[PDB]
């Protein structure tokens, strides 16, 4: 039997994973339906951009909407920064403004490079 004085690093890591999982499935659940008393909800909105200081915040909306598609073009589709930009413009822009902007993108009337 391979003891702790003879086990390698990967087998010890798997044994650590088994040891942790076999007890935290009893503590928290396999899905996590038991932590509802020990969970603190928090709401995430668009952060303050220092580049946009005025009370009119239409340019912040536009620049975030454009940074989303720039991120989508450059750094893939599932990069975390692109999701950050998407949630950032969704948090700021009215839905009518956004749907007008995709119909302008679909008609070909978007002046962005990408």
């Amino acid at each position: 039997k391979p003891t702790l004085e003879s086990l390698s690093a990967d087998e010890l890591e798997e044994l650590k994973n088994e040891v942790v999982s076999e007890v935290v499935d009893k503590i928290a659940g396999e899905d996590g339906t038991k932590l509802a008393d020990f969970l603190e909800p928090e709401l995430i909105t668009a952060p303050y951009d220092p580049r946009f200081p005025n009370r009119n915040q239409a340019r912040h909306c536009f620049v975030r909407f454009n940074e989303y598609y720039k991120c989508l073009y450059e750094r893939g589709e599932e990069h975390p920064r692109c999701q950050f930009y998407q949630k950032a413009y969704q948090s700021l822009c009215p839905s009518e403004w956004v749907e007008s902007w995709q119909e302008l993108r679909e008609k070909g009337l978007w002046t962005g490079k990408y």
């Binding site: 007890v23 009893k26 503590i27 008393d37 020990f38």
Partner: protein, 48 residues
């Protein structure tokens, strides 16, 4: 006289918000007490 009336009204508002903070400190202590009770139950849940 006008500023005296204003200061009286501001005194009542300050006492109102102090009483509201006194009340609001009471539920959040009992919430953490119930959380500690559930922690003491989960403690013996994993020791029995």
């Amino acid at each position: 006289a006008w500023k005296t009336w204003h200061w009286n009204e501001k005194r009542y508002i300050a006492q109102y918000y102090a009483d509201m903070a006194r009340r609001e400190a009471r539920e959040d202590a009992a919430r953490k007490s119930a959380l500690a009770d559930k922690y003491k139950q989960l403690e013996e849940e994993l020791l029995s």
